[model samples]
Target: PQITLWKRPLVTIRIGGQLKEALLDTGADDTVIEELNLPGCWKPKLIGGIGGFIKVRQYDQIPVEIAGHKAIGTVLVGPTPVNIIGRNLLTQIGATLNF
Candidate 1:
C-alpha cells in the first residue's frame, strides 16, 4: 500500500507488541525510538544527528508493524526527541516517496 507523505510523515506503528506513533523519516538511515523496555540482548551505540549524539540500545531482529505491513529489523531505543521510522524499516514496507 502507498502512503502520502505528510509534512512530518507521522504514522502509527507497532514495536515489540506495543503500538506507538513515529515519524517516517526518509532522510534517516536507521530507526530510532523513544525509551522502551524490550527483553533481549541489545548492543550499545551512539547515534549522531543534527542535534548531536545520543546513547542508545540497539536491539536486533525486532518485529515492527507499519500500516499493517510487518517488518523485522533493528530498533534503537534512547532519549530521542521523537520516535522515527527510518529507511531501514520504510524500504521493508515497500514505501516510496512520491512528489
Candidate 2:
C-alpha cells in the first residue's frame, strides 16, 4: 500500500478535559475526532466507521492549527487510531485538495 505523509500541525484537543493530539486528514468527509478512548461524560457523534456505523455520541470541538491555518471543529472524543480533518473544516477555510 502507498501512503502520503504530510507534516502538518496536529491539533491538541481536550476530551473529557483530557488533552490529546489529532492529525489532519483532508481525504475524509467530516472531522474524525477520537471517541473510542474517551471516558464517559464527553458527548460526541456516533456515525459510520471502518467497522461500519456505530452509535457513538461522545466528543468535543477543540481549536487547532495546520499549515498556518487555524479553525475549530467537532471531534469524536473517543479512542480513534487517527484524526481526520474532513471537509467541514476545509470548506470553512476554502481549502483545496490536489492529488
Candidate 3:
C-alpha cells in the first residue's frame, strides 16, 4: 500500500503598509492587490498584464518579507489572482516546492 502525500502551505508576507500571511503559489507570475483594501497611494495606472496592457491601479512598491527573505516591489491594487505567493517574489528567492 502507498500513502498519499501532502505539502504544508503556510507563509507570512508583508505588503506595502501592512504585514499579512499569504499562501504560496508556484504557478503564478505576478503579485496582485485588493482594490478595496489598498492604501491612498494606489492610483489608476496602465501596467502590463497577462492579457496585455490592462489598466491597473496600484500603490508604491511594498516591502515584502517571506521566510526571512525581503523585497521591495509594486503591488497592483485591483482585481488580481488573490492573496497568493507568485513568481514575482518566489523566483527571486529560488524557491522549489515538493509534493
TM-score list, all predictions? 0.92, 0.53, 0.60
Per-candidate Cα lDDT values, in order, are 0.90, 0.57, 0.63
Question: What is the lDDT ranking, best to worst?
Answer: 1, 3, 2
Across 10-98, the per-residue lDDT of candidate 1 in tens digits comes to 78999878999998898889999999988799999999899999999999999999878899999999999999999999889888887
Each prediction's number of clashing residue pairs? 0, 17, 0
Tens digits of per-residue lDDT, candidate 2, 1-99, equal 123465664666444445556655665667765545544355536566667675545444555454446666654544446766667676765676557
Which 10 residues in a row give candidate 2 its minimum summed lDDT? 1-10
Candidate 1: pairs in clash: none
Candidate 3's displacement at residue 25, Å, is 1.1
Candidate No. with top TM-score: 1
Candidate 3 local lDDT, 11-83, one digit each (tens): 6776655776666666656666555465557667765555766566766666777766876666666655456
lDDT of 2 at 73: 61
Native-structure RMSD, model 1: 1.3
Clashing pairs in 3: none
Q: Assess the local accuracy of residue 79 in candidate 2 as a C-alpha lDDT between 0 and 100.
A: 45
